[PDB]
Amino acid sequence: IDEALFDAEEKMEKAVAVARDDLSTIRTGRANPGMFSRITIDYYGAATPITQLASINVPEARLVVIKPYEANQLRAIETAIRNSDLGVNPTNDGALIRVAVPQLTEERRRELVKQAKHKGEEAKVSVRNIRRKAMEELHRIRKEGEAGEDEVGRAEKDLDKTTHQYVTQIDELVKHKEGELLE
Numbered sequence: 622i623d624e625a626l627f628d629a630e631e632k633m634e635k636a637v638a639v640a641r642d643d644l645s646t647i648r649t650g651r652a653n654p655g656m657f658s659r660i661t662i663d664y665y666g667a668a669t670p671i672t673q674l675a676s677i678n679v680p681e682a683r684l685v686v687i688k689p690y691e692a693n694q695l696r697a698i699e700t701a702i703r704n705s706d707l708g709v710n711p712t713n714d715g716a717l718i719r720v721a722v723p724q725l726t727e728e729r730r731r732e733l734v735k736q737a738k739h740k741g742e743e744a745k746v747s748v749r750n751i752r753r754k755a756m757e758e759l760h761r762i763r764k765e766g767e768a769g770e771d772e773v774g775r776a777e778k779d780l781d782k783t784t785h786q787y788v789t790q791i792d793e794l795v796k797h798k799e800g801e802l803l804e
């Protein structure tokens with residue numbers, strides 16, 4: 622029960638980080654290095670995030686300017702971003718992929734709002750499920766009677782509270798990502 626309640630919490634804050642990392646891959650205008658990072662490119666055999674083969678994707682703002690550490694690589698990166706959903710105009714002057722991220726249409730915007738609610742909804746039922754494995758061990762702990770019925774129930778009520786706390790972190794983040802999107 623110490624083990625359970627301590628493992629559950631720790632794994633819930635690991636999920637609040639994963640959701641935070643994901644919602645930041647949601648392109649929104651303002652532009653940023655996270656968007657350009659679900660995009661992979663076949664590197665000598667396998668496939669690789671562009672943000673792992675590129676030059677620190679420099680912001681500037683309106684635009685975003687790249688630069689690999691590989692001349693013969695610029696080709697598949699720009700085509701990578703052509704395949705991309707992001708919807709961006711990329712050039713490559715001869716050793717730099719420069720991209721103009723346009724403004725969002727009210728249509729694509731409110732489509733992102735939908736992938737963002739979706740992403741949080743997945744983040745949430747993961748913390749609910751994490752709570753379920755803790756609760757279903759506390760419960761066992763009282764069944765085989767390895768703690769006072771007054772000790773387990775106290776840990777039950779803490780779990781309920783931590784889970785719940787973490788569930789609203791996930792609602793906050795989304796709400797934030799949502800308003801970011803409705804500039």
